[PDB]
Design a protein around this ligand. Structure first.
Ligand SMILES: *[C@@H]1O[C@H](CO)[C@@H](O[C@@H]2O[C@H](CO)[C@@H](O[C@@H]3O[C@H](CO)[C@@H](O)[C@H](O)[C@@H]3O)[C@H](O)[C@H]2NC(C)=O)[C@H](O)[C@H]1NC(C)=O
Ligand SMILES: *[C@@H]1O[C@H](CO)[C@@H](O[C@@H]2O[C@H](CO)[C@@H](O[C@@H]3O[C@H](CO)[C@@H](O)[C@H](O)[C@@H]3O)[C@H](O)[C@H]2NC(C)=O)[C@H](O)[C@H]1NC(C)=O
Ligand SMILES: *[C@@H]1O[C@H](CO)[C@@H](O[C@@H]2O[C@H](CO)[C@@H](O[C@@H]3O[C@H](CO)[C@@H](O)[C@H](O)[C@@H]3O)[C@H](O)[C@H]2NC(C)=O)[C@H](O)[C@H]1NC(C)=O
Ligand SMILES: *[C@@H]1O[C@H](CO)[C@@H](O[C@@H]2O[C@H](CO)[C@@H](O[C@@H]3O[C@H](CO)[C@@H](O)[C@H](O)[C@@H]3O)[C@H](O)[C@H]2NC(C)=O)[C@H](O)[C@H]1NC(C)=O
Ligand SMILES: *[C@@H]1O[C@H](CO)[C@@H](O[C@@H]2O[C@H](CO)[C@@H](O[C@@H]3O[C@H](CO)[C@@H](O)[C@H](O)[C@@H]3O)[C@H](O)[C@H]2NC(C)=O)[C@H](O)[C@H]1NC(C)=O
Lengths: 346, 346, 346, 346, 346
């Protein structure tokens, strides 16, 4: 008969002594808030800043016995966000926020419904820009584990405990793709219970494993740098004598493999250690410079070394030729059989 | 006689029991909100972020029988946005917001008018930065379908239903142009009715088909890369012997076609797969390197190969010359007759 | 005797029935709001975004007969912006806002004064980021006409009409300069009266004509590209035979004129059509490549062509020499006499 | 006995008729507000935008006789910023704001104290982003005079007058350094009294003279470009004949001096006129191209010009050699003795 | 019995005369506020702007005897941030703010608890963007000392004194890493007590010593520039005569060592003085140009200098050869034994 918003104003008003500043079960057991999120959007995972933007639906559930109506005939009284500052709510925050905001377009994007036994569902929409430290040792083949962690701010462990619900604690939207990554399905769920000189505060966290799309770096970086090493060798499939074809086509490989090494570290943070794209760009400069070093070894013989003198001339220039037709692919393919296996076992 | 704002304060005040926290037709059929937008501005369609900024007039229409006056002699009571928090409004939001805001310069840019039978028109001005996933397989010749979708947040399907009106559900402003795209006239209108563990919520969406302006990429990228392949061949329209004119003008084509390939992927997201500008830049490097590979094949003969010996010298250097005057345009024009037709049928 | 703020609180308070939610001359003729702006700052005219930032003083004047006091001895009651939400104000907005804001440093920068006959002056300070479509056909020699337009949002044409006052409808600050443009003095003033399915709404607009500073593009782009075409020709003022001075100094012009063509399209939007800086950079590559094409024509003769044979050798190499000393300036100066006149008549 | 905040609530409350909307000395002489600032931070002086960020303490002093208590035993009643909207304050603003904000971290950073005779000190903390037009004629050796100006917005000259106090009208923080500039100690203080069709409004302004740090541009730009002109000449300290050492080492100077000219105009606004770094980069390309022009003059003689014929050969190649060993430093050092003196007298 | 929020509303309400506008111990000794921070996040230490972003938990402790309850049986009454504007709080601010903000996601991230003896703990979460002047004399090997300083704004020294507590005045979060730096453990704690014409105000400050990660600059800059100096010398391990192998491989070192010098000063502020990466890039161009200067010295002999004439030819070309095989590593390794020791003692 009486409408619920009219019914609820006396359920939690100044009458019946409801004070929104006081947690449920006061001077009792701690409040068990159970949580689950729903990732709408995900991404812009910057590595210069080592953070990522996420857009979630944070659902929180607890039990307020002061709100447990009995006589109203329905099962779920909702509550618009205008009266949402009138009940108790948990003081959740994110321990690695780095700035975040609500969404208020056409209405505060907030949801609240109250069951008969005082079970309270509270769902809001948040955009977060969460920090995650990026480990870039094996850079195009890394698995980034960027986390997010949810803590109480004012209430300690003996007053308020966060939990993940067992019914799908992290859902992901259906067509959620990433431009550079794959969000794996297994999401680790564990506690991070903090300690300060103020006290100990509850924490729960989720761990998202992000595996890269290697195919972009394979297209822009590896495959052109693979062919210049092949360009380094067909220029050695060359005429009898030393020639300017052995000169300009050797420094051709120098200009390209440094250009590929210049544009390699374009959008990378200035990490102190060495990453996997470096030791590819190192060898793809080392085998480039070993093409000019063979021509100088030929020029060390072509200027140094009339039937006996001409026999001593080609007694060295072909001992160096028929080996480097074989030795250059041997040391290169023994590198790839050692390079790729290390980055396909980690 | 009595002014409408004075008349309306008793129409929806504490007298006559109007509660703005309660939807129309409560414990009845769901509220049928019908919607249409008006795109003022559109654009800044970034592909690094995969989003786009739009500036709309969101019109919403529904029926509140509590507001249906009968005795006032007019037909449309308006209402300034100062008293706009005093009636019920739908809690619409955008499922791919990524940040949005109102416009409050000189007045809240909001409109509200109420007919005699309780029909309510509600128009606001919003700037949205909506996410859309970009498919870039055939990159300069793609048709991007970026959508926008309008959902309820608190009310489920049995309480509130969104509809597009049949009288022009998406209007576009008159001189609305795009810097890089063409907004097609046919705009798909369909439902995206969501399901959560909270419940099922209404959704309607519009699908904007965006076809690119190919002419910019044709000017900067294709036409210069077309002429270097022609530059690759007039350098083969060359003198009798091998010459440094066949040397420097061949690596000239190497420096330019990599420069055109360097500046090609300037503002592109790091997509894993391969796009259509790549397989043009691949062939426009492959036919470049097949110009130096012919000179090395000549230098493989010019150093290897006195009337019989000089007849064997030109017995190969012209068998390779008169074929590549014909074979280079044959394999190039058989590429364009296969390249362009695939990107003119999709 | 009684102070004006005390006098005004009863002039527009709950006594005397003044309702700020109701326009003047209600159920009468429409309100004639007359407007004029004062541009303090202007600029940051971006072409990537196709917008520009302006900082104005928006003055609005109308007549509220409810505010027409008679007995107070002064002529202009002012009103601080604290009580500014207490009278009726027009709901002006900008139809191409793209974000805007007020200025509230040390005080709301707002002004309000009321004459005896109810004439109301209302002046505020706004920063606007207004969109204007940029036509870039003749790019360094274009006249951009970027507009701004002022509309009502809630009131239709039969309730509220905007006008420009005839006494200087747009003033400009005294030392207002632009970094790249010249704001012309003639400013077009016309109507843009909108029509929607909601109704028809008033509009007035001003049109600012912006002519560029050509001298920057003449310094960085034209004058260096002019001298390389002269560098293309003094390298043809060369010795008798073919020489490497005719080789490296020809590709010198290739590297520079592409470098000038690379840095040409640095900060430009990706317009589909072709602009005037392109067809200068096209010809300044075409006459560059016609310098190497003459050396290859010489090398087509120097390898092809003993007193009769040496007479046939210079029977072609000087027929090509003494023409290109004349033909290269003839086709170049016939280009400038056609290029510049088209861009000095539009 | 009675605490001051309790004492002050009746000093300026509804009792004793204090109205915060009414200036002191109403219908009397104008209010003399005296001002002084304290620059905490200064800088980020961008020249693309032609503005600069400053962080000040704006102190304002005036006299309100309505606030002049007599009987309370102290000398300075302070007032927290919660009650700061309760007294009259001047409506100061900045005529070249371009966006500004207060600081509200942990408390509104605002200060207010009231002496016995109604003298009121009012100090706030503001961050400003002030526009200043940049004159860049002599660019690395310029003295920029960027100003800031403080005006009233609502009160005209006959009601409110701004003054600088004579006791240090602009203080600067102690260790305030600039990354690229030197703030000179002499700061000009003068009026800029505005006139509008509204009326005439008070203004005071301060003029900050900013002299650059020339040493950065001397390190990156001048000293490398100085040595290439020396590199241009040691390559002329060369062997007897024409050689490829006179070829590649000449175009070496072309590639570097254009690279230094490319990176010169990296962060500069697109000013129409010519600046001082240009006419250094012009001459440091002109003397570069006069090194290749001498080799072509030698090649004009080395191909043109057997005991009499060999005497005529070196009768020109050494007349050009021993002059350019002297003429190149003579015209270069006569340039620096004219270049630097003009930019060391202005 | 009575709940604390109900108990506290009469403890600090209008009854019992608590005025939040009045400091504790009024007309008494100054309030001793003791402080400690907790750095959650740290970084984005920009050097273009010379600032850094930090995310702290600011804890403040003082004693308000007006709040000292006696009869309530607990020891710590908390207080939600809704009623937080109802007690006295210190007006702390940061003397080098450059913009800062609170965090209000899901709740104002603020904490307040009150002991029995009026001890008040007050903890808030702030994001700061603090300015620090960067000294870059020895740039990759510098120790930056960026500070933060906490001052009162309204209360002078005789009313409010800040202190660091002796129990860990700066804590740092556990896994706090930096992308480019190492935050040292020793943090200097000292006073910075300000003086103005207003009065003298309290200050405390903390000094964070930041030592760089040298390994990134060693990977990108030093190690490639080390090998080009080795590339400069193996090209001198060359054949007998002068050769184009001594020509192109010498200017190869010119192009790379300027490319490494171009990309060196990529993200650096325009400091006037010279930094340590410059005098490495200077010498790594000087020993590059001393490779071409030896070839020109050989070409000064190879063109100048038949059994006696050929003995005088190699009487100089090997006196210059066998010295530069020894003199080039001697002057280079005597540089590193002087370069690195200066930057490993400071
Ligand atoms: C919130 O969740 C926590 C954890 O599930 C609940 O705390 C637990 O409450 C139960 C009963 O309320 C306690 O069990 C009792 O333990 C005593 C001592 O071991 C034993 O003698 C009894 O027979 C009974 O088993 C349990 O100890 C306690 N655990 C902790 C860590 O406190 C809490 O009750 C929940 N609160 C609400 C409002 O749901
Ligand atoms: C909002 O729009 C919906 C959909 O148009 C309306 O729901 C429909 O309402 C009609 C009559 O109110 C229902 O028709 C009736 O259906 C029963 C059972 O099929 C039949 O026996 C009756 O003879 C009559 O045809 C219809 O079923 C119902 N559809 C749904 C899906 O609920 C709703 O009434 C509208 N509400 C308002 C306030 O306009
Ligand atoms: C605001 O400005 C508009 C336009 O100037 C005013 O509307 C005009 O008002 C005049 C008199 O109020 C009307 O003139 C009358 O027209 C009738 C029919 O033509 C004629 O029989 C009368 O002798 C007289 O000339 C005029 O028609 C009307 N124009 C329009 C387009 O409505 C309006 O009155 C102004 N309102 C205020 C409050 O100043
Ligand atoms: C604020 O400062 C202004 C400027 O200092 C003050 O205005 C000046 O006030 C004095 C006395 O109040 C005026 O002096 C008188 O001038 C008349 C006519 O010249 C002369 O006959 C008298 O013997 C006396 O010298 C002076 O003219 C006036 N100047 C202006 C430009 O108005 C003003 O009084 C100050 N107000 C306050 C509240 O301090
Ligand atoms: C806040 O901290 C300051 C500094 O610790 C306290 O000021 C100090 O207060 C003590 C006693 O209240 C003063 O000691 C007395 O000094 C006089 C003169 O030297 C001496 O004759 C007495 O026998 C006694 O030792 C001390 O001088 C004073 N120091 C200063 C610099 O003022 C202050 O009391 C603290 N306030 C609170 C509320 O805790």
């Amino acid at each position: 008969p009486m409408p619920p918003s009219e019914f609820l104003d006396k359920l939690m008003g100044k009458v019946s002594g409801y004070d929104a500043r006081i947690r449920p079960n006061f001077k009792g057991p701690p409040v068990n808030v159970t949580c689950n999120i729903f990732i709408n959007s995900f991404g812009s995972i910057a590595e210069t800043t080592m953070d990522y933007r996420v857009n979630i639906f944070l659902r929180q559930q607890w039990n307020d016995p002061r709100l447990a109506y009995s006589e109203y005939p329905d099962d779920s009284l909702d509550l618009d966000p205008s009266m949402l500052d009138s009940i108790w709510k948990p003081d959740l925050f994110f321990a690695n926020e780095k700035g975040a905001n609500f969404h208020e377009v056409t209405t505060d994007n907030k949801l609240l419904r109250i069951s008969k036994n005082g079970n309270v569902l509270y769902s809001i929409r948040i955009t977060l820009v969460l920090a995650c430290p990026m480990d870039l040792k094996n850079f195009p083949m890394d698995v980034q584990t960027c986390i997010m962690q949810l803590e109480s701010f004012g209430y300690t462990m003996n007053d308020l405990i966060f939990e993940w619900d067992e019914k799908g604690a992290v859902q992901v939207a259906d067509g959620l793709t990433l431009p550079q990554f794959i969000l794996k399905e297994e999401k680790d769920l564990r506690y991070c219970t903090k300690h300060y000189n103020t006290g100990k505060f509850t924490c729960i966290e989720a761990r998202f494993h992000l595996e890269r799309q290697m195919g972009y770096y394979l297209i822009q970086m590896y495959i052109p740098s693979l062919l210049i090493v092949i360009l380094s060798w067909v220029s050695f499939w060359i005429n009898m004598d030393a020639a300017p074809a052995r000169v300009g086509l050797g420094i051709t490989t120098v200009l390209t493999m440094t250009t590929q090494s210049s544009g390699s570290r374009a959008s990378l943070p200035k990490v102190s250690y060495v990453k996997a794209i470096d030791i590819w760009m190192a060898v793809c400069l080392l085998f480039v410079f070993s093409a000019l070093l063979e021509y100088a070894a030929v020029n060390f013989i072509a200027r140094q070394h009339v039937e006996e003198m001409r026999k001593l001339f080609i007694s060295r220039a072909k001992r160096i030729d028929t080996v480097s037709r074989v030795a250059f692919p041997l040391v290169f393919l023994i590198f790839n059989i050692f390079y790729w296996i290390t980055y396909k076992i980690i």
